[PDB]
Design an enzyme around this catalytic site. Structure first.
Site: not given
Ligand SMILES: [Cl-]
Ligand SMILES: [Cl-]
Length: 162
Positions: A11, A20
Site C-alpha cells: 500500500e 487510489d
C-alpha cells in the site's frame, strides 16, 4: 515478514490525501477515506477519523494508528464472516496473511465473492486457486499486487515479498 510489513509494502505510506488506483480519496497506508468525488468530503472524513483539523495532512504516527485499526478490523471482519471464517481457520499462518491482505484491499464482500477459489482453498488445491483467482477484475486492475498475494496463497511462503 508479517501482515503489517506485507501490507505496508503493497500500500505504501502517504501523508497527504491522495487518489487510489480506483480514483478514491485515500491517505496513510491504504486507508480509504471516501468514494465520493469531493475533496471536501474527503477532508471531512479525514478530520473525523483523526479527531482534529488536519487540513488533509497527517503525521506518520497518525497513519500508523489508522493502519493498526484497519488491520484489526480486517481480521475481526473475517472472523465474523460465515463464509470467510472457515476458510481462514483452515489455513496456515502465511496463507492467512494473504487472506487478510485481500480483505483489507477489497472488503469482506469483495473477497466473499471469490467463492470458487475459497472453496478450493479449503480443499488445499493450491495451483487451482491461483489460476482461478487470476480470472478477475482484481487481477486485471492491480496485477503486480495481485500476483504477490496469489503467490503467497499458492505457496504458503513470503517469497513474493522478499
Ligand atoms: Cl476510521
Ligand atoms: Cl499493481
Amino acid at each position: 515478514m508479517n501482515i503489517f510489513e506485507m501490507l505496508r509494502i503493497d500500500e505504501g505510506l502517504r501523508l497527504k490525501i491522495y487518489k487510489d488506483t480506483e480514483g478514491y480519496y485515500t491517505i496513510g497506508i491504504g486507508h480509504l477515506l471516501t468514494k465520493s468525488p469531493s475533496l471536501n468530503a474527503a477532508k471531512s472524513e479525514l478530520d473525523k477519523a483523526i479527531g482534529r483539523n488536519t487540513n488533509g495532512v497527517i503525521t506518520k504516527d497518525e497513519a500508523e494508528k489508522l493502519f493498526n485499526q484497519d488491520v484489526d478490523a480486517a481480521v475481526r471482519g473475517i472472523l465474523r464472516n460465515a463464509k470467510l471464517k472457515p476458510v481462514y481457520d483452515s489455513l496456515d499462518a502465511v496463507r492467512r496473511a494473504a487472506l487478510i491482505n485481500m480483505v483489507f484491499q477489497m472488503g469482506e464482500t469483495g473477497v466473499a465473492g471469490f467463492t470458487n477459489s475459497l472453496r478450493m482453498a479449503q480443499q488445499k488445491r493450491w495451483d487451482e486457486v491461483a489460476v482461478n483467482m487470476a480470472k478477475s477484475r482484481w487481477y486485471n486492475q492491480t496485477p503486480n499486487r495481485a500476483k504477490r498475494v496469489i503467490t503467497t496463497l499458492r505457496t504458503g511462503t513470503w517469497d513474493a515479498y522478499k
